[PDB]
Amino acid sequence: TELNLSHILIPLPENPTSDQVNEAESQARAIVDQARNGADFGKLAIAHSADQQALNGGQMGWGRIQELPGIFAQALSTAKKGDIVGPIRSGVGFHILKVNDLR
Amino acid sequence: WEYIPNV
């Protein structure tokens, strides 16, 4: 019914250049790979996330999937505990989510 | 949700 998630943002400014996009996507994809191979996601957020909750491991707590931005909710369809989703692009950059738990 | 990032 509800999911517990954490988030990481690899930032991009408005109207980013190709060089900026390629760098951010590369870093985001590498973080996804690390997270899918056992790296502590909260510590990856502490080290790399630009979002305001980075120091708290990007924790989002528990919630209902459809209340999140559609780009997140859609990507979380049928996701299982431990899944890493992303990179997901939006105007602010590349997003990565970890499904910490489900209940 | 306790926190929802901006997109």
Side-chain angles (χ1 to χ4, degrees):
Chain A
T1 298
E2 288 195 323
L3 277 60
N4 185 296
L5 305 175
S6 290
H7 173 262
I8 286 173
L9 171 67
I10 299 307
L12 283 181
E14 190 184 67
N15 298 312
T17 67
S18 184
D19 288 347
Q20 294 175 310
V21 177
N22 294 347
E23 183 175 64
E25 186 169 4
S26 166
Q27 170 161 42
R29 291 184 176 279
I31 290 169
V32 172
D33 290 338
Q34 292 175 86
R36 287 184 180 152
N37 190 31
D40 185 303
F41 193 88
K43 295 179 186 178
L44 286 168
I46 286 162
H48 307 115
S49 186
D51 183 88
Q52 69 185 307
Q53 286 303 307
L55 288 167
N56 195 42
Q59 292 177 69
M60 290 167 59
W62 290 99
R64 293 181 286 186
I65 189 170
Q66 292 311 318
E67 294 188 337
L68 300 171
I71 57 176
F72 292 177
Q74 288 179 165
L76 290 164
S77 173
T78 70
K80 313 294 266 289
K81 175 176 189 185
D83 287 355
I84 308 300
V85 177
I88 298 163
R89 186 169 182 183
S90 82
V92 302
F94 289 104
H95 304 268
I96 303 164
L97 302 166
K98 173 161 191 178
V99 182
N100 301 135
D101 207 350
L102 305 208
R103 72 185 179 192
Chain B
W1 298 105
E2 181 53 46
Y3 160 62
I4 301 179
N6 287 130
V7 299

